[PDB]
Design a protein around this nucleic acid. Structure first.
Ligand SMILES: [Mg+2]
Ligand SMILES: [Mg+2]
Ligand SMILES: [Mg+2]
Ligand SMILES: [Mg+2]
Ligand SMILES: [Mg+2]
Ligand SMILES: [Mg+2]
Ligand SMILES: [Mg+2]
Ligand SMILES: [Mg+2]
Ligand SMILES: [Mg+2]
Ligand SMILES: [Mg+2]
Ligand SMILES: [Mg+2]
Ligand SMILES: [Mg+2]
Ligand SMILES: [Mg+2]
Ligand SMILES: [Mg+2]
Ligand SMILES: [Mg+2]
Ligand SMILES: [Mg+2]
Ligand SMILES: [Mg+2]
Ligand SMILES: [Mg+2]
Ligand SMILES: [Mg+2]
Ligand SMILES: [Zn+2]
Lengths: 137, 99, 97, 49, 122, 86, 116, 116
RNA sequence: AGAGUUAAAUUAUAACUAAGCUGUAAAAAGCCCUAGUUAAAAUAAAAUAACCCACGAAAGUGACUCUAAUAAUCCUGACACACGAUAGCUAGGACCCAAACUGGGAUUAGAUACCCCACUAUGCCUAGCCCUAAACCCAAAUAGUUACAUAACAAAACUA
């Protein structure tokens, strides 16, 4: 059972299949986990949005959507909407650091989606645009 | 009358030179439940652990073989004028007077 | 009059100084395979001295070569090339535990 | 010695007459500078594959 | 070798690569420089998608051009190569062989710094 | 953006294990220093504060390394005292 | 202003035998055409010392130091004619001029004919 | 390894600009810091979620699903046992590391020498 | 000091999906020409390497390449000469982003403050000024010593 955590880059001749599809055809689930909200959008390999569900759309409120349960419910709703269109495996791409980071990821599993790979795509500027000033002057 | 320099030049420690990876013969003078105080004879006494093989054969006065690592463990730290002597030596157990 | 007195001579037991892995070597900006061994496969960070173990010159030379290659178009910045991913491990950093 | 060393290299330089031959020779003779290292300090090359 | 040119040409056919190399070397010789050798590094996948000449390039051929040129024509060669549509990214640097490999002496043991504070009793 | 996707910071789960895959990815990020950098870049820090933070971190790291080295050196003397009652 | 030929066959490859027997490529590579500004500075210093000084071997002499600093002063003026906003090189040129003036005063106080 | 300290502080013999500015003098103390209390985290959250799933799906009745009710109690009992026994076991032994009470006494045996 | 280049992020700009996005301890205001994904110039800045301590007289400098180049056969020495962070002024250009000020939203008895949103001068480039800092490492420059000797703290005491 030689298993490597590195992704199966299409340039190689690897033979790994999930539900009969290759790694390049498996849909993507972008989870933007902000400090006040968590937006989950399920798109296909052709970059076609299939399921979209966020904490704000889940009937929450200003401070109600900042908790991890909001991310879990948004993930459950996104998983239900994606399974309504007939998907089994999905690749989770996490964007940003927030309280609802792992809760949103586990929400898909709770709602009935299998996670095969987790990719951390967090915007890291190489000292680009100047961010806002520090709080608590 | 033999001189101190003359006897030091012929001392076994002078012939040994560096204390790195040198085979020496020591004699155990104190016994603990799991630790053995072996006096290799240079300056201090090293502390070793009783091995699983022939553990009962290690008694007080038993002679053993050692591979000496350091003659005296001293090191410097932050704000320390002098070194921190461990009052011991670093050595490992190989056998018990194989003859 | 004593012939057994110590003589002020050099130390005969002086051990050779430890060398960096690239000691007396040539570092280049075109050997992407060599340059990738010092970068993280997942993030692409350049490992420091405590991870690599290089003496004072080669660490800076490797850093400069990596920075030059990342901009000249020879080595990716965001990740390590999967072609060179199967290279022998020279760093002393372990991620998976 | 430097002048003599450069004299030998002057024969292999690229000129107007040798431009066409050198272009074709380069287009058919690839070169690689990739070589890795080990913990012992020995060089390894992928050309043995 | 004095200067080194890392020529990233657009991935094209064999005759077009030959013509591009011929004209690039002719332009380099016209500026007063003699080309020492021409080394081809092969056609590899580009590390990143390079945008040049209003074209998105995913592949490219690498070439190594070592030559001797005066210090005044480096900018003229750079400007000439900047406007070439068949060049993805031209770069002129100093050849690595002109810098002698000095003696990498090794890891000299640096002792712990002392006498940074007074002997006052705490 | 210009680089190929699903290559950097990508962890493949094994046997459907997601909780441990997330922990492995977080350990990757912490050891690469991405978590601290992201938390620091949320609000801009002035160079005067950056120099103070760097100096404080360097001093703390040196002190911790020296304390750990001394603890490891003195670990030998943790054995039971054979000369009790002397 | 001095006009060093681009084909001067600079000093590092000038006193060795067999320089004129090789083909044109070797001479062109070993000449000032492919050289940097430091080689031209060395050539100018050698040419100025061979004509102004009386003992080219006496480098520690005040006149030799004055000639060496004059070469650097001319180079700094040439650099300044191109770079107007460069302040470090302007400071270098001004302090080199001050040092040359101090050495000229010392030479005038010590040996008047050499100073003149 | 330990980062270098030469040329870091501001001293009379140091010619360069100081690199490190110590908040307090870098003297190795004779006692280590006491282990900061590891704030306890909520347990059996996953078990409670699947327990409340039965209530949400079956309109809040325990007669529909029973295993999701019994496993929640088992998790609560295991968490209580872990809170009780480990709070003593970890304070008694820390495997590789030593307790701070033993570390302080060990350091007092071989303290630092700032003076003399 | 000049010339050339951009790896990440961000944005003007188009396409699919949703009614929400941002915002805090909690809210409100603001934006719903909004948000998520796929592509995308210009401007600004230059993650890790840096646990490195180098260059420069100082201020200051660490994305890359090329050119010029870093005084003194080396004492101290001005009111003379030349520089001199950020902030500010003038003329032109640029403006993603941040933000004085200002206008709204919270808390406050009051809040013309600390919390949130929008925006200006400004931070950017060229040329010309202003010549100020906790310009501090509060320890002057040049060649030295570990002799006598702890007001206190702090970076030990001192010579010509
Ligand atoms: Mg203030
Ligand atoms: Mg300096
Ligand atoms: Mg203080
Ligand atoms: Mg300019
Ligand atoms: Mg970009
Ligand atoms: Mg615009
Ligand atoms: Mg509102
Ligand atoms: Mg950078
Ligand atoms: Mg100098
Ligand atoms: Mg002076
Ligand atoms: Mg203006
Ligand atoms: Mg703002
Ligand atoms: Mg107001
Ligand atoms: Mg503005
Ligand atoms: Mg300004
Ligand atoms: Mg100013
Ligand atoms: Mg300052
Ligand atoms: Mg003052
Ligand atoms: Mg003075
Ligand atoms: Zn080395």
């Amino acid at each position: 059972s030689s298993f490597s955590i590195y992704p199966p880059i299409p340039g190689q001749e690897n033979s790994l299949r999930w539900a009969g599809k290759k790694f390049e055809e498996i849909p993507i689930a972008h989870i933007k986990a902000s400090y006040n909200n968590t937006q989950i959008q399920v798109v296909s390999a052709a970059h076609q949005p299939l399921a979209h569900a966020s904490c704000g759309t889940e009937g929450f409120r200003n401070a109600k959507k900042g908790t991890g349960i909001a991310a879990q419910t948004a993930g459950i709703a996104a998983a239900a909407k994606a399974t309504g269109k007939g998907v089994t495996h999905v690749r989770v791409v996490v964007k940003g650091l927030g309280p609802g980071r792992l809760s949103a990821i586990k929400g898909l599993t709770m709602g009935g989606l299998e996670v095969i790979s987790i990719t951390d795509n967090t915007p890291i500027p190489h000292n680009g645009c100047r961010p806002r000033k520090a709080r608590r002057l | 009358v033999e001189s101190f320099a003359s006897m030091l030049r012929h001392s076994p420690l002078t012939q040994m030179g560096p204390a790195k990876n040198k085979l020496v013969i020591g004699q155990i003078f104190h016994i603990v439940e799991d630790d053995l105080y072996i006096d290799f004879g240079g300056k201090f006494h090293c502390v070793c652990k009783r091995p699983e093989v022939d553990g009962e054969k290690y008694q007080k006065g038993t002679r053993v073989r050692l591979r000496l690592l350091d003659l005296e463990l001293t090191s410097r730290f932050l704000g320390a004028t002098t070194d921190t002597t461990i009052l011991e030596a670093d050595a490992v157990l190989l056998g018990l007077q194989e003859s | 009059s004593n012939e057994d007195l110590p003589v002020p001579m050099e130390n005969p037991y002086k051990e050779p100084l430890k060398k960096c892995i690239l000691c007396e070597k040539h570092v280049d900006y075109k050997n992407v395979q060599l340059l990738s061994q010092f970068i993280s496969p997942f993030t692409g960070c350049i490992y420091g001295r405590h991870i690599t173990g290089l003496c004072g010159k080669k660490q800076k030379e490797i850093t400069k070569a990596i920075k030059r290659a990342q901009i000249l178009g020879f080595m990716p910045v965001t990740y390590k090339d999967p072609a060179y991913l199967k290279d022998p491990k020279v760093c002393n950093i372990k991620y998976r535990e | 010695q430097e002048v003599l060393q450069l004299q030998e290299e002057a024969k292999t330089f690229i000129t107007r007459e040798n431009l066409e031959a050198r272009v074709e020779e380069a287009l058919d003779s690839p070169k690689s500078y990739n070589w890795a290292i080990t913990r012992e300090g020995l060089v390894v090359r992928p050309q043995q594959k | 070798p004095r200067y080194e040119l890392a020529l990233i040409l657009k991935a094209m056919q064999r005759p077009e690569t030959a013509a591009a190399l011929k004209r690039t070397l002719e332009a380099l010789m016209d500026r007063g420089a003699v080309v020492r050798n021409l080394e081809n590094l092969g056609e590899r996948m580009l590390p990143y998608k390079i945008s040049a000449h209003n074209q998105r390039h995913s592949r490219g051929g690498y070439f190594l051009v070592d030559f001797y040129a005066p210090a005044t024509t480096v900018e003229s060669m750079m400007e000439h190569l900047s406007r070439d549509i068949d060049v993805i990214r031209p770069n002129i640097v100093k050849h690595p062989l002109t810098q002698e490999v000095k003696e990498c002496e090794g890891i000299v043991p640096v002792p712990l710094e002392e006498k940074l504070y007074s002997t006052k009793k705490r | 953006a210009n680089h190929l996707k699903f290559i950097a910071r990508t962890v493949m789960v094994q046997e459907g294990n997601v909780e441990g895959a997330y922990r492995t990815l977080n350990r990757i990020l912490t050891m690469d220093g991405l978590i601290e950098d992201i938390k620091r870049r949320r609000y801009y820090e002035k160079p005067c504060r950056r120099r103070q933070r760097e100096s404080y971190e360097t001093c703390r790291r040196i002190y911790n390394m020296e304390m750990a080295r001394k603890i490891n050196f003195l670990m030998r003397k943790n054995r039971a005292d054979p000369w009790q009652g002397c | 202003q001095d006009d060093p030929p681009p084909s001067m066959l600079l000093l590092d490859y000038q006193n060795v035998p067999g320089i004129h027997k090789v083909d044109d490529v070797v001479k062109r590579l070993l000449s000032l055409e492919m050289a940097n500004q430091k080689e031209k500075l060395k050539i100018k210093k050698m040419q100025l010392m061979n004509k102004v000084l009386e003992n080219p071997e006496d480098t520690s002499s005040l006149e030799a130091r004055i000639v060496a600093l004059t070469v650097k002063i001319r180079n700094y003026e040439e650099h300044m004619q191109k770079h107007r906003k460069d302040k470090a090189h302007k400071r270098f040129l001004l302090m080199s001029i001050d040092q040359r003036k101090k050495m000229l005063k010392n030479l005038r106080e010590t040996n008047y004919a050499v100073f003149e | 390894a330990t980062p270098s300290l030469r040329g870091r502080l501001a001293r009379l013999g140091n010619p360069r600009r100081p690199i490190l500015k110590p908040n307090k003098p870098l003297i190795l103390a004779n006692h280590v810091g006491e282990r900061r209390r590891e704030k306890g985290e909520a347990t059996c959250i996953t078990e409670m979620s699947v327990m409340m799933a039965c209530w949400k799906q079956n309109e809040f009745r325990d007669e529909a699903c029973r295993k999701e009710i019994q496993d929640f109690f088992d998790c609560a009992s295991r968490a209580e046992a872990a809170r009780k026994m480990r709070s003593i076991q970890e304070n008694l032994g820390e495997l590789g590391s030593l307790p701070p009470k033993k570390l302080n006494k060990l350091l007092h045996r071989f303290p630092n020498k700032p003076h003399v």
